[PDB]
Design a protein around this ligand. Structure first.
Ligand SMILES: [Zn+2]
Lengths: 153, 341, 142, 129
RNA sequence: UUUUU
RNA sequence: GUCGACGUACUUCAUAGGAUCA
């Protein structure tokens, strides 16, 4: 049947669609600029926070997270990278100091302990079906005052 | 005026009266009030909107502080119980409460609550008349206990707010710090009455401070004690004695409901699909996709702003991506898994 | 003021010593391959009766499979169990409440915040693990 | 190139326990591998295992039961005296009776305590705990 | 200030 | 010669961050 041709078309659309994302994903992978990634991360966080995509952490989730942090102390300057930066006057620079900071605050966050949404469907189905013209329009009158796709058109 | 009727859906883009427009003309009310009735029948919310609409139609029965202290606030404390961010619901509380007052004690109640006794009478009379046209044109003898109605449910409270936004879609204002944090620096010491707001479709001036709007003294939000809501509906603007534009609050609206209400209007535009972790374009078909977008509310000479991202169902109709439906976060997450399996 | 304290000297804590184990202490013992019982006997040259409370134990059970080693070491029969009579499952608050109540315990921990808050309390020997073995801070008998 | 079959086998077992796999395939087999697994099995860290013959070095299939915390090989196989055995136990084991240190001594492959009981010593094969 | 089906 | 390169020895500049309060 000719329905087989339709199946070929939609598969073709899928494959090329994958190709476009592949090329776009490839190009982004090559760009490894610190600032470029830094801009992208901030924007992503803003959208996720704005959309509230991330579920709230119950008291249990906080307790387990705090337990692990206290258990390891992974977010203090005794870590390798922090110690190496500190001991060699590398953190005098602002940018590395921010990164060391950004680590530290994240650890601190984990350490913290008469009687007097359902979106409305305002389509016509939910309107009160109220019930009550041309001759009145005669009175207003009484006032006075795809073609050519394949052929020549 | 033609724009206003267009925003409310009365007129199409050709200035031609819509089926909604013809229905509004059957009411004696302003176009704004008629539209709220066009959305009020859902979940037996009709008496509440009638009470609100009648109260707004006849004017405020409340006596203001300037026109006149302890007995003043206890009365208001009673009628602001339904919601802490809704002046309109203060009107509803009074009107509905009046229905349960015996005829003999009514005059005592109105005086005791600093209520303009007459205006209440027209509201009840107008509440009866609107009740009559509705039942007469939907199917009529109306008796006084028909006006008696019980407290709205929390769901109904949410529906009523959006319902009102339909009649006041064009009168949404956003806190200035959200749009221009540099220009609008809010501190914890800042009085609520002095928190700037910006209305939608306000003419962009060289100085954005010129577009700032501030809350009325009469509003409960001055006594709220915490930060006001992000978005606010207003009825009218008044010029304060200090040359400060002053707004009469109606009620607050959340971001996602606002987008839904503006969707059927011309206020809402959709950005391109977002990308990143969590947010990804699930492609059902060459003509179908599910994705997150950033709705923009408002109409580069007017002040519009972007709303919270929302999951939407998009279809490629005539080569353009058209939003069919909104989707909850759970539904979108389930969709993503359904594609993976 | 506790009668067991002479100015800043605690004249009650004598051998054999009673020592409270903090959760983080166990790992730093494990990271350094320091046996808990012998490690303390070595630092203090005394018999030490290790004590582990419910809250710290509850913390340990919460940790998960990754810290199973600490857990079984925690359940060693030589380790005595302390009952907790307070709702909160936090460990740091529980420990300091105990040392405040009675002045006989050594606190074994490496958490800087808890160490600082113990340091404020007088007459509380503070013990830690660093380098290669345990170290005792405020204990004159050494 | 492949230097130590024992290290390969132990790493495969450890990863199989990482992923929760109840059973693991080891290639190639050897006598030392079998003896090491027999010690592990006597101490109960691993369950049954199978030797599959292919007229070559062969294969092994070990059942894994979730009581193995870690297994490793000490390469090079240092010579160990009875004086130095306690040093190795202190270095390679978290505690004094957490696991065993396996030695290939002149009387065979066995854990450290058995070597002490027999009063023997030799080269060090690895550790299990 | 007014004011309307 | 107030010379160049290198070696050696020293000096110096880049440290504040979050919360609350006025
Ligand atoms: Zn406790």
């Amino acid at each position: 049947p000719e329905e087989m041709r339709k199946r070929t078309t939609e598969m073709r659309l899928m494959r090329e669609l994958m190709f476009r994302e592949e090329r776009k994903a490839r190009r982004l992978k090559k760009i490894k600029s610190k600032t470029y990634r830094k801009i992208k991360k901030k924007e992503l966080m803003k959208n996720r926070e704005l959309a509230a995509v991330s579920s709230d952490e119950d008291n249990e989730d906080h307790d387990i997270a705090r337990a692990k942090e206290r258990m390891t102390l992974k977010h203090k300057t005794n870590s390798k990278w922090a110690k190496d930066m500190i001991k060699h006057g590398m953190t005098n620079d602002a940018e590395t100091r921010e990164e060391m900071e950004e680590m530290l605050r994240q650890g601190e966050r984990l350490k913290a302990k008469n009687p007097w949404d359902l979106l409305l469907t305002a389509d016509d189905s939910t309107r009160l079906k109220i019930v009550d013209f041309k001759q009145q329009d005669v009175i207003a009158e009484a006032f006075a005052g795809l073609p050519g796709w394949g052929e020549w058109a | 005026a033609i724009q206003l009727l267009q925003y409310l859906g009365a007129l199409d883009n050709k200035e031609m009266i819509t089926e909604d427009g013809k229905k509004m003309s059957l009411f004696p009310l302003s176009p704004r009030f008629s539209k709220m009735l066009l959305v009020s029948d859902e979940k037996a919310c009709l008496p509440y909107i009638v009470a609100i609409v009648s109260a707004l139609s006849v004017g405020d029965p409340f006596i203001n502080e300037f026109e006149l202290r302890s007995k003043f606030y206890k009365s208001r404390s009673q009628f602001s119980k339904l919601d802490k961010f809704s002046d309109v619901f203060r009107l509803l509380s009074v009107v509905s409460a009046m229905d349960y007052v015996p005829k003999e004690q009514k005059e005592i109640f109105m005086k005791k609550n600093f209520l303009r006794g007459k205006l209440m009478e027209e509201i009840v009379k107008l509440r009866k008349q609107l009740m009559y046209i509705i039942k007469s044109n939907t199917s009529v003898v109306i008796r006084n206990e028909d006006l008696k109605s019980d407290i709205p449910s929390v769901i109904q409270i949410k529906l009523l707010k959006q319902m009102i936004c339909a009649g006041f879609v064009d009168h949404v204002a956003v806190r200035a710090d959200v749009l221009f944090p540099d220009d609008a620096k809010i501190t914890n010491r800042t009085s609520i009455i002095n928190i700037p707001y910006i209305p939608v479709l306000a003419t962009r001036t060289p100085n954005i401070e010129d577009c700032f709007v501030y809350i009325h003294p009469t509003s409960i939000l001055n006594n709220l004690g915490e930060m006001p809501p992000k978005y606010m509906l207003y009825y009218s603007l008044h010029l304060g004695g200090n040359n400060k534009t002053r707004m009469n609050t109606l009620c607050d609206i959340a971001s996602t409901p606002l987008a839904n209400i503006a969707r059927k209007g011309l206020l809402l535009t959709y950005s391109k699909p977002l990308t990143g972790q969590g947010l990804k374009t699930v492609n059902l078909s060459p003509t179908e996709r599910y994705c997150y977008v950033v709705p923009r509310f408002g109409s580069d000479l007017k002040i519009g702003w972007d709303l919270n991202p929302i999951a939407v169902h998009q279809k490629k109709q005539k080569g353009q991506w058209t939003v069919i439906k909104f989707i909850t976060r759970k539904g979108f997450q389930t969709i993503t898994g359904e594609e993976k399996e | 003021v506790s009668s067991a304290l002479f100015f800043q000297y605690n004249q009650a804590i004598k051998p054999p010593y009673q020592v409270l184990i903090d959760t983080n202490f166990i790992n730093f013992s494990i990271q350094k391959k320091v046996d808990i019982v012998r490690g303390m006997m070595d630092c203090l040259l005394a018999k030490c009766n290790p004590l582990i409370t419910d809250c710290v134990m509850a913390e340990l059970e919460k940790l998960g499979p990754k810290y199973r080693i600490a857990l079984k070491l925690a359940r060693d029969p030589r380790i005595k169990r302390l009952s907790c009579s307070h709702k909160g499952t936090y460990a740091d608050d529980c420990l300091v409440h105990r040392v405040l109540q009675h002045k006989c315990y050594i606190v074994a921990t490496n958490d800087a915040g808890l160490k600082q808050r113990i340091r404020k309390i007088p007459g509380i020997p503070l013990m830690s693990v660093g380098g290669h073995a345990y170290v005792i801070e405020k204990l004159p008998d050494v | 190139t492949r230097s130590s079959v024992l290290a390969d086998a132990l790493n495969a077992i450890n990863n199989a326990e990482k992923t929760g796999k109840r059973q693991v395939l080891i290639r190639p087999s050897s006598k030392v591998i079998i003896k090491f697994l027999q010690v592990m099995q006597k101490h109960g860290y691993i369950g049954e295992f199978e030797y599959i013959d292919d007229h070559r070095s062969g294969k092994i299939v070990v059942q894994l039961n979730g009581r193995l915390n870690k297994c490793g090989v000490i390469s090079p196989r240092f010579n160990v005296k009875i004086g130095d055995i306690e040093k190795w136990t202190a270095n390679l084991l978290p505690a004094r009776q957490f696991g065993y240190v396996i030695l290939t001594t002149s009387a065979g492959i066995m854990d450290h305590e058995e070597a002490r009981r027999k009063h023997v010593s030799g080269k060090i094969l690895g550790f299990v705990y």
